[PDB]
Amino acid sequence: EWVRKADRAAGPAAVLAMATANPSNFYLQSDFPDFYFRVTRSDHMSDLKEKFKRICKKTTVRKRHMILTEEILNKNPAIADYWSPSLAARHDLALANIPQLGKEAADKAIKEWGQPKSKITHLVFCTSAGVLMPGADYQLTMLLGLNPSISRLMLHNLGCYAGGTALRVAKDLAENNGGARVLVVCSEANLLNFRGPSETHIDALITQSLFADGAAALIVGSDPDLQTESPLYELISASQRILPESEDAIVGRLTEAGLVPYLPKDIPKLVSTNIRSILEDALAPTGVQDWNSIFWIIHPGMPAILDQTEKLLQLDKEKLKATRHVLSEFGNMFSATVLFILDQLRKGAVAEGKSTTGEGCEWGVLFSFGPGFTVETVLLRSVAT
Amino acid sequence: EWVRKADRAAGPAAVLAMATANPSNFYLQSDFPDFYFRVTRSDHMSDLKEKFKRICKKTTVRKRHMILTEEILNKNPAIADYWSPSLAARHDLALANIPQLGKEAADKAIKEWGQPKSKITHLVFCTSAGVLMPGADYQLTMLLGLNPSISRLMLHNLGCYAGGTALRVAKDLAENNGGARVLVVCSEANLLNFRGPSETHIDALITQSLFADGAAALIVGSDPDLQTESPLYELISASQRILPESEDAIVGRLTEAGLVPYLPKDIPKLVSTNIRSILEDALAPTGVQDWNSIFWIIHPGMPAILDQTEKLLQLDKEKLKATRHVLSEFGNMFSATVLFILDQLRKGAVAEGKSTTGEGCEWGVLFSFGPGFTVETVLLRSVAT
């Protein structure tokens, strides 16, 4: 059966360009326990700093970019406390930084893409760093001079899986609308989550060892003009799932003092229990049988999950190389992290001279997660280099 | 040119079912100035109550449903103050009420629809009443027993235009995915916006005369099974637009004390300046030339805009009947209001015995607005009754 093309697109959505950006300011992880416990006026919790020193080392993170400088925290001490009224201050920083960081990545993706901005017909903007009305999607549209008639989808506070949601959304936008070009921006920062330490909230302390700032921007479109556009990946399928028996696994409470996390259930075991059949279902239409014949993007919000999945599916230790590089060099930038990893995977495949944007593989899987417990899974097809 | 149907849908997205729900508790507008100034411990502002009495009369609102009872406000006095730290309390009420109110409307829409819940493949959930992680989309999925693999899009804090966004989103979800059935829920309440009066913030006081609680639920799907499903409307086009010279027209600041509005620019003039060409562009593919040969849904967040548009396009005074009925009986329920109006328009067309779900008209326009200044415009096609 055939249908008239009419106003729709013929073929699957493709990533046509990708780029990332971060705040200029960064912290080496080796320096962070000292910096953190100083600026939060918590140097007296010697035994807690010792726990934090161990937490920070086991993250395998090396540096993290952050908007929050010692100077900004000094001018906003409520942000540095464990729990003081500070939401308005955090949202003032979000308005000054999140759309701007998104534009830095968007400029670079549009440059790689090579087409004029006026051909962008849709914008998907994800952030958990600040609820703005109008949103950062609006502010970015104004800063970039995009068409005022652009179709925007603003995704506030989905949490760490939203990079998968953004691709899932962009796929239908691109495929249903002939000529549509979708600018996808995940722009993230710890502005809502950053706070001082508490001996009674170790979960919250662990998040201070991992979360970081950064933005990723993509152009997604179907029916590429192969004379002016160069696909990097195809978005073949995109699915979302609540895992069984995962009620309240990850909760984020938005309060007067910003975002406060609550993580009672064991996240690594939840993923291990379910990852295999989720990826089997994803790979079912490809006829792949070797876990090592595909490329990998796994959200690294809990580094232990990377090791455990690697062992479980018996992956070649180079499979998660791009994933671990981003974790080491940038930390967990919330929903943007899997898109950083995608770009790093592409750049390493090209630099190392492989045959496909998927490190020589044809098929690939992108997997991220967050509150629900929710898992976003994307089936990707590489392109010949 | 033709394309293989493959996994996509053949025809345009259709509304297949619709229903609404509200909190049991309501307030007659004639009683509200007394109730409001009492519970906010503000009876001493006699001159402000007098302004409020006049504001409430000119709204043309008759009743409003609200979660907030005198009892709840007594147990949460910070909510009743103009500006006291209260976000966590407001979000506790959101978690206890917003997904639940959405389920009340969803149950009724699914009943009208007549198919099993397990055929729902997508959920679009809009609210500005509380940022939850996981969102009310998750909570509703759990309360309704929807498939854990449902594709959800959670839309937090877009503001009053999100009813148009929800239809715009559902359209692409339905049309790009063969067999997809999209549950659309706008569930809204004043939980973030409700506060005591200030002589120095008249804008905030006006919003207390209009905002109300309610949920609307729709089933949206392409390729209806005409032996089991009965389309009510077709979603023919859906567009979003930032109006020129409208920077900061509507701003909503999410603070320690909840949502605080800021409305410097003149909203009625902004709409009047731009409405006509926006609707002409919407109607361009229909060949309609008579503004009175189409049916109407206009977001009634500012009642003055209804009169002014009516005069400007010289509408038959019955055109905005369904719109004004919802405003009178329910007030402004944020993004849900245009969907209430759509359902009222359908119910009145059937009850009054007209030839189409569009009061006998073929084409219709749905127009809502909010921060940006953003306008969402939907072109609807009715169905023979």
Task: Name all domains of chain A by residue range, CATH numbers in brackets.
Answer: 14-221 (3.40.47.10), 233-382 (3.40.47.10)
| Contact: A148, B371; criterion CB under 8 Å | no
Any catalytic annotation for residue B160? yes
Asked if B47 is an interface residue toward chain A (Cβ–Cβ < 8 A), one would say no
What residues 275-334 of chain A have any CB closer than 8 A to a CB of chain B? Answer: none
- What are residue A357's phi and psi, to 5 degrees? -60, -10
Q: How far apart are CA A16 and CA A290, in angstroms?
A: 28
Contacts A152 to B, Cβ<8 Å:
240
Asked if A241 is an interface residue toward chain B (Cβ–Cβ < 8 A), one would say yes
Find out whether A334 and A370 touch, Cβ atoms under 8 Å: no
Cα angle vertex B85, ends B80, B89, to 5°? 70
| Contact: B158, A133; criterion CB under 8 Å | yes
For A164, residues 6+ apart whose C-beta sits below 8 A from its C-beta are: A238, A240, A338, A366, A367, A368, A376, A377, A378
Contacts A155 to B, Cβ<8 Å:
153-155
Nearest alpha-carbon partner for A56 in A341, A332, A337, A370 = A332
B233–chain A nearest CA distance, Å: 20
Tell me, rounded to whole angstroms, the distance of Cα B157 from its chain centroid: 12
Q: How far apart are CA A376 and CA B354, in angstroms?
A: 46
Q: How far apart are CA B175 and CA B191, in angstroms?
A: 35
Tell me the CB-side half-sphere exposure of residue B145, using CA atoms within 13 A: 5
- What are residue B7's phi and psi, to 5 degrees? -95, 10
- Per-residue DSSP letter, A27: E
In chain B, which residues are last before a break of more than 2.5 Å from C to the next N? none
Q: How far apart are CA B311 and CA B268, in angstroms?
A: 13
Q: How far apart are CA B86 and CA B90, in angstroms?
A: 6
Contacts B259 to A, Cβ<8 Å:
133
Q: Alpha-carbon torsion A39, A44, A45, A47, what sign?
A: positive
Find out whether B203 and B341 touch, Cβ atoms under 8 Å: no
Q: How far apart are CA B26 and CA B23, in angstroms?
A: 7
Q: How far apart are CA B290 and CA B183, in angstroms?
A: 33
Closest in A3, A85, A372 to B256, CB measured: A85
| Contact: B247, A91; criterion CB under 8 Å | no
From residue A256, how far is each of A89, A203, B134 by CA, in Å?
A: 11, 19, 18
Asked if A185 is an interface residue toward chain B (Cβ–Cβ < 8 A), one would say no
Closest in A87, A155, A374 to B256, CB measured: A87
Token pair recorded at residue A197: 């330490």
Find out whether B342 and B297 touch, Cβ atoms under 8 Å: yes
Nearest alpha-carbon partner for B148 in A372, A276, A370 = A372
Token pair recorded at residue B68: 């907030």
Cα angle vertex B329, ends B327, B334, to 5°? 45
Angle between helix axes B32-39 and B46-58 (nearest 10 degrees) is 140
| Contact: A244, B5; criterion CB under 8 Å | no
Asked if A64 is an interface residue toward chain B (Cβ–Cβ < 8 A), one would say no
Q: How far apart are CA A72 and CA A67, in angstroms?
A: 8
Q: Which residues pair with A361 in a beta bridge?
A: A358
Q: How far apart are CA B377 and CA B277, in angstroms?
A: 12
Cα angle vertex B358, ends B217, B271, to 5°? 80
- Judged on CB neighbours under 10 Å (0-12, 13-18, 19+), B178 is middle
Find out whether A330 and A266 touch, Cβ atoms under 8 Å: no
Q: Which residues pair with B258 in a beta bridge?
A: B255
For A276, residues 6+ apart whose C-beta sits below 8 A from its C-beta are: A312, A313
Q: How far apart are CA A376 and CA A369, in angstroms?
A: 6
Asked if A69 is an interface residue toward chain B (Cβ–Cβ < 8 A), one would say no
For B175, residues 6+ apart whose C-beta sits below 8 A from its C-beta are: A8, A176, B8, B9, B11, B12, B13, B222
Q: Alpha-carbon torsion A106, B163, B204, B76, what sign?
A: negative
Asked if A147 is an interface residue toward chain B (Cβ–Cβ < 8 A), one would say no
Closest in B156, B168, B171 to A131, CB measured: B156
B364–chain A nearest CA distance, Å: 20
Which method was it determined by?
X-ray
Asked if B251 is an interface residue toward chain A (Cβ–Cβ < 8 A), one would say yes
Q: How far apart are CA A225 and CA A206, in angstroms?
A: 46
**Chains A, B: CB pairs < 8 Å:** 168
Position of tokens 């759990």? B142
- Judged on CB neighbours under 10 Å (0-12, 13-18, 19+), B119 is middle
Q: How far apart are CA A222 and CA A342, in angstroms?
A: 19
Task: Specify the resolution in Å.
Answer: 2.0
Q: Which residues pair with A17 in a beta bridge?
A: A219
| Contact: A155, B150; criterion CB under 8 Å | no
* Strand B122-127, strand B63-65: pairing: unpaired
Find out whether B218 and B17 touch, Cβ atoms under 8 Å: yes
